[PDB]
Write a protein that binds this ligand. Sequence first.
Ligand SMILES: [Mg+2]
Ligand SMILES: [Mg+2]
Lengths: 244, 240, 195, 222, 233, 235, 204, 217, 231
Amino acid sequence: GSRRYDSRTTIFSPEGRLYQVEYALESISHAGTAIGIMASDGIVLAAERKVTSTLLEQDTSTEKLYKLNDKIAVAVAGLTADAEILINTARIHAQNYLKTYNEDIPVEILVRRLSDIKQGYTQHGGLRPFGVSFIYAGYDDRYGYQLYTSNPSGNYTGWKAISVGANTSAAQTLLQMDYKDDMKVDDAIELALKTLSKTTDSSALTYDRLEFATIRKGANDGEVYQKIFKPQEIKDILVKTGIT
Amino acid sequence: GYDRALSIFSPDGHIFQVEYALEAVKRGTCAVGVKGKNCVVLGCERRSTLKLQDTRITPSKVSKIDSHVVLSFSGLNADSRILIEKARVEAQSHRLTLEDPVTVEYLTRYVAGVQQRYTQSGGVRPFGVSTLIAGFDPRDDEPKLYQTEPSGIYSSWSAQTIGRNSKTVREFLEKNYDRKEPPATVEECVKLTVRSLLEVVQTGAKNIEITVVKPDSDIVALSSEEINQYVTQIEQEKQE
Amino acid sequence: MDIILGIRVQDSVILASSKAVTRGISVLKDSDDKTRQLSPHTLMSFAGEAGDTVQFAEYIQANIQLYSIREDYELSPQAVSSFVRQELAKSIRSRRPYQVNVLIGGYDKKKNKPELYQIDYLGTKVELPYGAHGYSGFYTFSLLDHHYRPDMTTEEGLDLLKLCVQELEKRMPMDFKGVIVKIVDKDGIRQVDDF
Amino acid sequence: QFNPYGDNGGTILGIAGEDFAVLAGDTRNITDYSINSRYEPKVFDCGDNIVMSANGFAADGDALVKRFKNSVKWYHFDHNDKKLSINSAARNIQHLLYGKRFFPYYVHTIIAGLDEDGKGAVYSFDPVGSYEREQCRAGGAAASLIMPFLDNQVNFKNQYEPGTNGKVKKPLKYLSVEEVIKLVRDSFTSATERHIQVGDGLEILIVTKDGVRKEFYELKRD
Amino acid sequence: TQQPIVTGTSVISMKYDNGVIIAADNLGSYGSLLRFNGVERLIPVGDNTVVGISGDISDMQHIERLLKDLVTENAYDNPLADAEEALEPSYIFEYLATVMYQRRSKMNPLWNAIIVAGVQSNGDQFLRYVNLLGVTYSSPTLATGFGAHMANPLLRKVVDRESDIPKTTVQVAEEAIVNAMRVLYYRDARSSRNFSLAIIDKNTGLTFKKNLQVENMKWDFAKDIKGYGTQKI
Amino acid sequence: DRGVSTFSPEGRLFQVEYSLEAIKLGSTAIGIATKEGVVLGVEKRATSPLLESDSIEKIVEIDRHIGCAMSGLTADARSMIEHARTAAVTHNLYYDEDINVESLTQSVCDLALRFGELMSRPFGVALLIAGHDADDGYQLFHAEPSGTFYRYNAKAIGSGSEGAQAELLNEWHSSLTLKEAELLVLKILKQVMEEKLDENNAQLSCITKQDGFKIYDNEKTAELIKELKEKEAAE
Amino acid sequence: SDPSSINGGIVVAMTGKDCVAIACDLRLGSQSLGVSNKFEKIFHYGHVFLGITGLATDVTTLNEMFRYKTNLYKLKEERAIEPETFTQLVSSSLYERRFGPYFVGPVVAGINSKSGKPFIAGFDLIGCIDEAKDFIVSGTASDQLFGMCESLYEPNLEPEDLFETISQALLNAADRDALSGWGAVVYIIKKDEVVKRYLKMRQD
Amino acid sequence: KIAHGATTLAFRFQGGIIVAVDSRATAGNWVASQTVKKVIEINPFLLGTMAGGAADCQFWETWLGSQCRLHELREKERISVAAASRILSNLVYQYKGAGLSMGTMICGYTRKEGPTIYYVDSDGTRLKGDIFCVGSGQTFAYGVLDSNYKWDLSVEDALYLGKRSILAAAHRDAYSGGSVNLYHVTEDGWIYHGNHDVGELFWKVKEEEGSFNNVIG
Amino acid sequence: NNYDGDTVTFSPTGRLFQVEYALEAIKQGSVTVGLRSNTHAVLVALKRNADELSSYQKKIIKCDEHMGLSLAGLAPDARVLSNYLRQQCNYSSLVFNRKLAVERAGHLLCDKAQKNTQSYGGRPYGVGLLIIGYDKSGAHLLEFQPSGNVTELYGTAIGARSQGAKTYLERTLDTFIKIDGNPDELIKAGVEAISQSLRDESLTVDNLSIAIVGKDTPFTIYDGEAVAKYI
Ligand SMILES: [Mg+2]
Ligand SMILES: [Mg+2]
């Protein structure tokens, strides 16, 4: 019957690893690098678009950075189509929580929900996992500014600074070297771009090959603003930091 | 629906998927449980390969199932969340129908039953998780410490360890733990738990987590400095 | 059941609930506590159809206690009230609706403010300085409209509450066998054993 | 509107002796003011030394008896031909009745036989499955005419010993099978006189350790 | 739940020494309108059974189809379908009784009163009644609707109890049935003059008589009846 | 791969035969039936000295008149025990009586072959079901994952089964007392166990008509062990 | 008994020159009993304003529902929803509950950000769109409001003049309805500024 | 015409719980039975009282006994009165609206709780209390109970008080009578204290007590 | 070989190996004999024990007052099929007031077994059955195979060493068919038939199992001292 053709996506190896999760992580290691850096007065999200073209319409394009709600955003590394499925589910979950409790969803609760969905695909259903790793940048009134990551296994962890995708080993070493606890957003912006500039597989880092975003309390009085950077604004911050 | 029998017997009478789930537990960070005369302590390893971590928000290894029971684990982190959620729901469901919070044995029997169910259900793999469940029964001052594993078998332990290099720390506990006279105080129990982890951990900095549970829903997690004082005192006595 | 009252003063919320339980012809009990603690700083009183009242209150209690354990965090009174409203709004279009009216008295530890929410069985929520359900408001609101201040002490709130109960005991036909009074403030929930 | 229930009349009577039990019932079946049948058996041998009658709406009555007989058969299959005791049959019938609690079998059920000590046993049921062991029970249309007579002549109610004047009760001496049948016959003859739905014939099933015996007697046909 | 629309009136029947007789008129009424005058309400099953049906005609046609399907089904993988394993009257009745009670229990009845008349394998007479409620009973005489009130009293004068059955011949039994049909035509406002009659005998088998008429009627005395009391002319 | 409900060329179900191999790896359990009662005994087999041995529950009550001992993948037995308890109680509700031991065993064995592609595999545990009823008296049954159950005068299951069964072959007779049976279980358990038998690593139980099913205290068993040592040294 | 008149209340909307106005009372009651004088019936999602009369639990539920939906709209569309589009969303959402409807009387008001054109719309409890040029009325004093609006209204009123007209329409209508009043709010809406004014009225 | 009419009571005291019930069942004015068992023996430690629907009470309190037996098999411990009463109330609450008729006192005596009584109702009510009285003659029995009840009653006097209270109801309430069944609930289980015919009991109490002077004897 | 993994696969020569493997389970089972006359029908079964402490596995199952069978192979599969027969016999009685024909009972068993041989996931039944009964057309004996094939016979045997008993019945055909109105002599012939399949072991009191049905004889099973008469 049908058993003959079943790959069995939810089984352990003799060593106690999940085959499909490990292979999905291998897929993600070839994706464009995404970096998240948390500061005292905000969070930075930086990400590299993969080998683009001059004929790509950049100003209307979005492959890396997505908005989940007004307080939470994500950076994507892996299959974009897979990510959009999960992103829409996360957007709905945030709204369900808001309707139920009349309060914005705490960052961790949203992260846990998406991570549990990823987990399910590794334990039951016989389907392939989502080939996606997220960096979650968000704010709530309990823990303040928070950075998380999740991967196809459905395991998530909190971070001060983190990278996903390609060259994470090299990127994490550079972040671990120059990161300090009393750091500010403007400094974090510079660190993120400098790290990408060194780890990139491209010849030079330019505005058309980047997506950038910040989550600041730099909004008029006690509130939080999300800023998805425009192509011209990415070009300006590249000149300001002295990369181009 | 996906109905494929993943957990099955082999010619030699083994269920490899259940046995490979134990190998995932072997890979997991070390967890230890020690019960004193009037307390239980749960020790947990944190691998120091991950720095630049935010320890405020990172999921802690020890989880409260109710105000009087706690659960730690070794193995797949994502899998453990599913067991913890189910356990928490069942704890509230028990309070709602029986008026009385769960006994530690009951909560263990439930979690163990869920694990077993996933070893002979179609289209699912076993949990790659072993748990240590500890606490005090309502209106009772006798310490409780149980263990569960992917197969679904469970049992009570005076002291037990699970995870990577658990063989070594179990060796330590077997020679150092006396049944006729267990750790009489909280200090003695915590000290023995930290000592047992120091056989395996590496550095005694942020790699050791300690959680003390006492009777009548008195649960507290020790800080870095408090644990560091135990680490300091142990090695100074060792230099002799 | 019959009478449930609520008043929000300067630094606390006070809930008063009748003790009587009547099975048609006879008063079966005169010491019934028509309330459940949802969290350390949130109390819910209730009145409506027999059985549904306790079943609903305990169901809500279980859900909030579950949330508290999962997040290791107490929900705000506003958040709890919204959850309760949604459950009642869901219930009103069910096969057999919960016939339950509630008051939710809570102290928000973040804002350092007492909060009183009135919710009926339809899922109609309002935040009020003082509130009631059933016929209780018809007698008491005129006294509360006259005497109430936002800067009242807890002791002044209890005195105003005594005046409300006295008016109920005078003009209501039913003997509700007095009230159990409970106070919700920064230190938690406590019962006034002499009233 | 469609009415799923009907009334087939009839009257039944169960009496428990010391080492025997009888279950009697008239053989007349009716609707409104018409006679359907002058001889339609209403008391049945269900096996295992148990007799049964489900009086009231005959369609429900036949259905219940049929399902109980079926239960006895499957009890033998599932439990190594074990004899179904009268108390176990009674509990089983409760579950059959209560299974249709919200669309009841419209019948008054009575079973009779011997308990596990060999003593006479009668059990009585309401339509929704409440039951009770009894020494004496009439069911159906003329139950109100028969029971007061049985209270007086079986249990000796309101009867005292001459000379004492209300101080000493009449002693509850045991009745033989011949004595019980006399009381059954007089109960139905009296019921026949004053109840229009009672008549035609009387069929009595007698249960002893030896088995189940039958007796038939004519009743007035008007 | 429904209401009966096109309806058939009385079915009457009785036992005699060597078998059973059953009869029913050929009318299908539509309320007070005597709409359909050629309706056969006796339906034979094999050569040993006749099912007489009253009440709703649409439901009768459904039952007729069930019985037709029953004969087909019984013949499947059955070498003795026309011998030892042929359909008995008792089998056909129990099947119908099961269906009737099941349908009433779903609050959607077949709005009929049915009499199954036949002769068993061992020669025994079979005669039993079932209706929309699933109620069943047997008697030496059976009748539905108005027949219960007017036919039974006449037929019971011939066979009053079980012991009268061997003393009753087929000629006497048929005579009583035919007379009863005349009485029903005098007195039932939803009856017709035309009827069918069926005899199932253990010796001579199934005799099915169609297009019978009520005859030898008394009407002459009507000429002498004038007014409603005082009127003389 | 291959079907879960596949027959081998010899006419056996692969998965059922493989589950029998898992039962052979399990700890020993012995049952002996007498006219005075049925005795059930098990090897606890703790994996470490820190494991509190009294928490090892390999002997279990199903009803007052029925007990049960297990061997193999003991986690699999929990749903079987749950079903057995439910079946016993349900029958009492329906019939106002105790359920026959055979009927209870049959109900448990009906679960056995409910596996396919229902549960995903057969049970990896064997059960010794002991009890008493009025019809057939004191009884002992061996319930396998094949769905087959045999009645036994005496039976051993687990790792030391064939050695223990041979010993039960010689020792059992129809006039055994309850005390004689208790000592006989202890004797044979001691023979096949790896570690030295004591009250902490072995457990006894019995079922009698009067007192019903009882698990023996460690103090009570300790005396029976001491009584055994002396009578073996007596010759 | 009648769900649309248990709680009471009213909403009115009007168009002016390069502006729109929407207003509502503040009462919430249980039939005769006045319960709250702070129950606002006008909500906004971006620059689109929604007033809702009728059963109060449904008023609250629908607000939470349209907040839910307009937030998802904005995330996917990368722009705020417009009054014309929102009107269709309200209609669609109400009609999906055709045979188990929300007992409400919604009123949409706003200015299209691109064209600058003033827009108002009204609905029945099941979704029918009434897209009037002049004014929309809803609630337990809708008859009274129709009378006030039909006489007081004139086209192309300036924002500050429109304020007076809509305020007087609401106030005097409310004073002839037992279940309306207990305070009032008026929103004056221009292309890039919105003013909110609480009115002083009789409290009986 | 289902049976109707009853007087049942239960009260907590120093020596445990007294349960007392009448024995009459009526279908309209017709007295169907004088020998009805209105105390259900759930198990040797738990008692329930029958009022409202006879079948509903019988069926579901027997069922409750089965659930209590399963609980103690699984948990190796006696079920609490709180837990048992809750299993029944939650069950009937599922059926709310369908037409179940139940008014019962679940009575027990455990270590952790002591003597405990829970009034359980078919509309979902579950009330803990010291004295409960349910049925058509409940008001008559309450009068005798309220005026004579003390916590420090002896077992002998408490048994009589329960007997006397049912008698009061049996006399005045047309739908109560037949006989009185008494039970005493202790920690080690319930103890049955006999069947007492009301006819004989009335005259006996009248003479010995001097009560019922309105009645000629 | 490559075509025996499941029941849904024909071999190149048109064989169904899973069905044939299920047939093999019957050959491993203990011997059982069936035979009939014109008045009665008899089952004789050699019960098998696990060891000396164990009981002897029951081989005969009653289906109705007028019908029953004996098994050889997987006993739980016989319980499933016998349960199905009990239900079908019972459906016939309740609905049609009719005792189920033995021939029709065989047709129902054939069709139930067939469905398990053509569908994926399931497996064939691993048991053979000998059904006896007395209906309106006299005494009957059927042989059921889990391939689906059901056959009406005068006599037969299935199980291990069943060929010996089958040959004996083939010789005795003319004699035992004539044994009318004599149950004891018909059983004697069945006991003598099953004896031809014995090696080493002989027929003891708790080894032998006999069942009979006939004209005025309900289906009854004889075990223990009730069969000592025939040893
Ligand atoms: Mg009469
Ligand atoms: Mg006013």
